[PDB]
Design an enzyme around this catalytic site. Structure first.
Site, PDB file in Angstrom:
ATOM      1  CG  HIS A  79      -9.915   1.836  -9.116  1.00 24.97           C
ATOM      2  ND1 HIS A  79      -9.547   0.986 -10.134  1.00 24.97           N
ATOM      3  CD2 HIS A  79      -8.799   2.089  -8.398  1.00 24.97           C
ATOM      4  CE1 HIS A  79      -8.255   0.725 -10.035  1.00 24.97           C
ATOM      5  NE2 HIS A  79      -7.772   1.406  -8.983  1.00 24.97           N
ATOM      6  CG  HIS A 235      -4.289   4.623 -10.827  1.00 27.58           C
ATOM      7  ND1 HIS A 235      -5.629   4.606 -11.179  1.00 27.58           N
ATOM      8  CD2 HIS A 235      -4.081   3.550 -10.030  1.00 27.58           C
ATOM      9  CE1 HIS A 235      -6.191   3.527 -10.682  1.00 27.58           C
ATOM     10  NE2 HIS A 235      -5.257   2.860  -9.942  1.00 27.58           N
ATOM     11  CG  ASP A 239      -4.999   2.925  -6.375  1.00 23.95           C
ATOM     12  OD1 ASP A 239      -6.127   2.743  -6.964  1.00 23.95           O
ATOM     13  OD2 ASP A 239      -3.939   2.349  -6.699  1.00 23.95           O
ATOM     14  N   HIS A 262      -1.758   0.117  -0.579  1.00 22.15           N
ATOM     15  CA  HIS A 262      -2.937  -0.332   0.216  1.00 22.15           C
ATOM     16  C   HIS A 262      -2.492  -0.741   1.626  1.00 22.15           C
TER      17      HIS A 262
HETATM   18  O1  LIG Z   1       0.320  -4.492 -11.296  1.00 20.52           O
HETATM   19  C1  LIG Z   1      -0.807  -3.982 -11.300  1.00 20.52           C
HETATM   20  N1  LIG Z   1      -1.223  -3.106 -10.388  1.00 20.52           N
HETATM   21  C2  LIG Z   1      -0.414  -2.568  -9.288  1.00 20.52           C
HETATM   22  C3  LIG Z   1       0.248  -1.262  -9.756  1.00 20.52           C
HETATM   23  C4  LIG Z   1      -0.799  -0.176 -10.048  1.00 20.52           C
HETATM   24  C5  LIG Z   1      -1.025   0.555  -8.750  1.00 20.52           C
HETATM   25  N2  LIG Z   1      -2.054  -0.159  -7.968  1.00 20.52           N
HETATM   26  C6  LIG Z   1      -3.370  -0.043  -8.249  1.00 20.52           C
HETATM   27  O2  LIG Z   1      -3.805   0.552  -9.207  1.00 20.52           O
HETATM   28  C7  LIG Z   1      -4.350  -0.677  -7.310  1.00 20.52           C
HETATM   29  C8  LIG Z   1      -4.163  -2.168  -7.313  1.00 20.52           C
HETATM   30  C9  LIG Z   1      -4.969  -2.607  -8.513  1.00 20.52           C
HETATM   31  F1  LIG Z   1      -4.108  -2.724  -9.569  1.00 20.52           F
HETATM   32  C10 LIG Z   1      -6.003  -1.497  -8.770  1.00 20.52           C
HETATM   33  N3  LIG Z   1      -5.758  -0.468  -7.717  1.00 20.52           N
HETATM   34  C11 LIG Z   1       0.350   0.523  -8.088  1.00 20.52           C
HETATM   35  N4  LIG Z   1       1.058  -0.626  -8.722  1.00 20.52           N
HETATM   36  C12 LIG Z   1       2.281  -1.002  -8.447  1.00 20.52           C
HETATM   37  O3  LIG Z   1       2.936  -0.434  -7.627  1.00 20.52           O
HETATM   38  C13 LIG Z   1       2.912  -2.150  -9.135  1.00 20.52           C
HETATM   39  C14 LIG Z   1       4.373  -1.899  -9.455  1.00 20.52           C
HETATM   40  C15 LIG Z   1       3.989  -2.869  -8.334  1.00 20.52           C
HETATM   41  C16 LIG Z   1      -1.651  -4.253 -12.488  1.00 20.52           C
HETATM   42  C17 LIG Z   1      -2.753  -3.597 -13.053  1.00 20.52           C
HETATM   43  C18 LIG Z   1      -3.160  -4.201 -14.264  1.00 20.52           C
HETATM   44  C19 LIG Z   1      -2.373  -5.317 -14.632  1.00 20.52           C
HETATM   45  C20 LIG Z   1      -2.557  -6.024 -15.782  1.00 20.52           C
HETATM   46  C21 LIG Z   1      -2.666  -6.563 -16.859  1.00 20.52           C
HETATM   47  C22 LIG Z   1      -2.688  -7.168 -18.040  1.00 20.52           C
HETATM   48  C23 LIG Z   1      -2.554  -6.443 -19.227  1.00 20.52           C
HETATM   49  C24 LIG Z   1      -2.550  -7.087 -20.466  1.00 20.52           C
HETATM   50  C25 LIG Z   1      -2.669  -8.473 -20.542  1.00 20.52           C
HETATM   51  C26 LIG Z   1      -2.808  -9.212 -19.369  1.00 20.52           C
HETATM   52  C27 LIG Z   1      -2.820  -8.566 -18.130  1.00 20.52           C
HETATM   53  S1  LIG Z   1      -1.097  -5.572 -13.493  1.00 20.52           S
HETATM   54 ZN   LIG Z   2      -5.816   1.515  -8.511  1.00 10.47          ZN
END
Ligand SMILES: O=C(NC[C@H]1C[C@@H](NC(=O)[C@@H]2C[C@H](F)CN2)CN1C(=O)C1CC1)c1ccc(C#Cc2ccccc2)s1
Ligand SMILES: [Zn+2]
Length: 292
Positions: A79, A235, A239, A262
């Protein structure tokens, strides 16, 4: 009228939490000399460990883009690297007091404000660009990522979640559309069932509705909703722009992603670098005639 390298005019400080580690982190962005690039610096260690933001230094690529040098890591660079790319910063030191870049609000917006607050300094060296000359594509399962020659810079992305909250497609040409206005505010997101599993593996320790779109089976749980109708795919673009900046020069070309992330983005970067017939490094004597 030469396109020149850029750095920060002033140092910038900010505080936050790592999304994964949940650790408080102090971040300082510092001007750097010509031909430095973006360099992360673990100032909590002695001696201080510096990792150039470059494709060769990328470690595991599960839930963020991680730079690694021996057993020292810098987590979740994508980011902040996105923000740097969006404002055309070539040279900067990024000081961290811990292993992870702070998540801030889940987007690049706070970083783009911090950098513009500091101001930009043009340097007396030509900016180097990687120009895509040949289509380069990688695929794995149903996922695909491509570079196509294009006289400018643009990113197209499509995602496909079988989820009630789902437009899953967007294309932005960064010569005619603002990164700041259209992409920078797009926040990371998490599905309740992934979040429950990530916690159980000591990940997303820093996660909250303050820094992420939280989605249950049906809807966004965030009180104030989305910033963009298409925030999720916007988003993914944010990324990708961060990952693309690991090439170490700005791109002239087009990135297209289909369910990419990624891991496949890094595969594409490595494949582009490896096929030297597919790209050239170029400079521009005149911004007035240049493709961006
Ligand atoms: O799962 C996540 N990110 C991955 C997702 C966002 C995207 N990736 C990106 O944004 C990349 C990878 C990092 F997240 C940043 N940059 C693509 N992507 C996906 O494909 C997911 C579906 C498999 C999460 C982000 C915040 C979470 C939380 C939380 C939380 C909330 C309340 C209380 C306790 C905890 S979980
Ligand atoms: Zn991200």
């Amino acid at each position: 009228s030469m396109i020149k390298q850029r750095t920060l005019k002033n140092i910038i400080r900010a505080t936050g939490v790592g999304l994964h580690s949940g650790e408080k982190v102090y971040l300082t962005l510092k001007p750097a000399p010509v031909d430095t690039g973006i360099v992360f610096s673990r100032t909590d260690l002695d001696p201080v460990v510096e990792i150039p933001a470059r494709a060769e230094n990328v470690g595991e690529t599960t839930m963020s883009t991680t730079l690694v040098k021996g057993d020292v890591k810098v987590d979740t660079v994508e980011h902040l690297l996105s923000a740097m790319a969006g404002l055309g910063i070539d040279n900067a030191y990024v000081e961290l007091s811990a292993s992870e870049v702070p998540i801030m609000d889940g987007s690049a917006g706070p970083f783009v404000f911090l950098i513009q607050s500091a101001g930009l300094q043009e340097q007396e060296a030509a900016k180097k660009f990687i120009r895509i000359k040949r289509e380069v594509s990688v695929e794995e399962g149903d996922k695909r990522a491509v570079f196509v020659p294009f006289d400018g810079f643009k990113v197209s992305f499509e995602i496909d979640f079988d989820h009630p909250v789902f437009t899953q497609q967007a294309s932005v040409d960064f010569s005619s559309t603002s990164f700041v206005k259209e992409v920078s505010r797009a926040r990371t997101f998490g599905f309740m069932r992934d979040i429950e599993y990530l916690r159980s593996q000591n990940l997303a320790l820093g996660g909250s509705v303050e820094n992420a779109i939280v989605v249950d089976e049906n809807r966004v749980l965030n009180e104030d909703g989305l910033r963009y109708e298409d925030e999720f795919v916007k988003h993914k673009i944010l990324d990708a722009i961060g990952d693309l900046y690991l090439l170490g020069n700005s791109l002239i070309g087009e990135f297209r992603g289909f369910k990419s992330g990624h891991a496949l983005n890094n595969q594409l970067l490595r494949t582009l670098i490896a096929d030297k017939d597919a790209w050239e490094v170029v400079t521009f004597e005149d911004a007035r005639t240049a493709p961006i």
